[PDB]
Amino acid sequence: VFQEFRQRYEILAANAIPKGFMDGKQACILMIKALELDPNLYRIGQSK
Amino acid sequence: SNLEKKQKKFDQMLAEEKNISSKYADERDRAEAEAREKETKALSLARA
Amino acid sequence: SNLEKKQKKFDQMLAEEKNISSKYADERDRAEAEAREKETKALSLARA
Amino acid sequence: CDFSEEQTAEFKEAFQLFDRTGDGKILYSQCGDVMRALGQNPTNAEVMKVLGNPKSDEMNLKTLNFEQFLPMMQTIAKNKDQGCFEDYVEGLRVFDKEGNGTVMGAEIRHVLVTLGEKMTEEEVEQLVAGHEDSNGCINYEELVRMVLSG
Amino acid sequence: DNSSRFGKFIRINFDVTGYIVGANIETYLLEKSRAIRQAKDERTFHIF
Description:
5 chains, A: mainly alpha, 2 helices, globular, D: mainly alpha, 8 helices, 2 strands, 49% helix, Myosin heavy chain 11 (chain A), EF_hand_dom (chain D)
């Protein structure tokens, strides 16, 4: 789940992820982009 | 993708490793100077 | 294949920089050990 | 020497108090335990600078007198400073999955055993006072605030 | 030669700390008929 993904790995993108409250999937997308993952290796749902 | 990320990382890491190497060289020379100072102190104590 | 052949050079350069860094670390620790030995000597002389 | 006469006397008292096997000289491994009892937190690498016995040293043949002990205590004391509780609890805020300022006891006790240097459950369990009762989520503030008194 | 005549399910129960605190052994209907109507070179229950 997106909140769990962020809370577990945020250290890797803490400078990129904004402090203000929002949909955690945006923060997850920012982190996944910072890691530069190939879009075939993952899929983003509404919760999972 | 992994190889590209690594290529970027190696470039950064080599430059930082040069900085670390330089820091160790400085600390080496500081420890050598300390050794000389305490050697002088030991000789003074022996003479005393 | 091209990326691997390229990364062999970076790996080699980083490995040699690590060798130099390690040599400085060894000399640093040698000088530090010398400092401890002569400090012990100075303390013995002071007690005497 | 940066230590006072009173500190040197206290160290000499400690040196001969934390004894003995039989001889009045302290053992090579046990020396580290004396330094730790004197409230210092150096890594075993600090001892490895002297490198008494490169192999497994059950025998502890590299015994120390006070004149050999005191320089090691000094290089330990001058090694490094130590960070505030915020530097500790940031690690816990990263390890946590609840996002509430506490952490699951069963998970954290395992993590603190596996990561870095190894410790026994006997060692680790004694560090916690807010034990894992009906509530699994231990407040790690109590742990850090207690141990930092040492 | 060691063929089970019965189906079984074991379970072990844990506390909040993650240690064992109890257990249960469920066992289902067994091939009881064979025990007195033995086919060639087949055996009854080992206990006999």
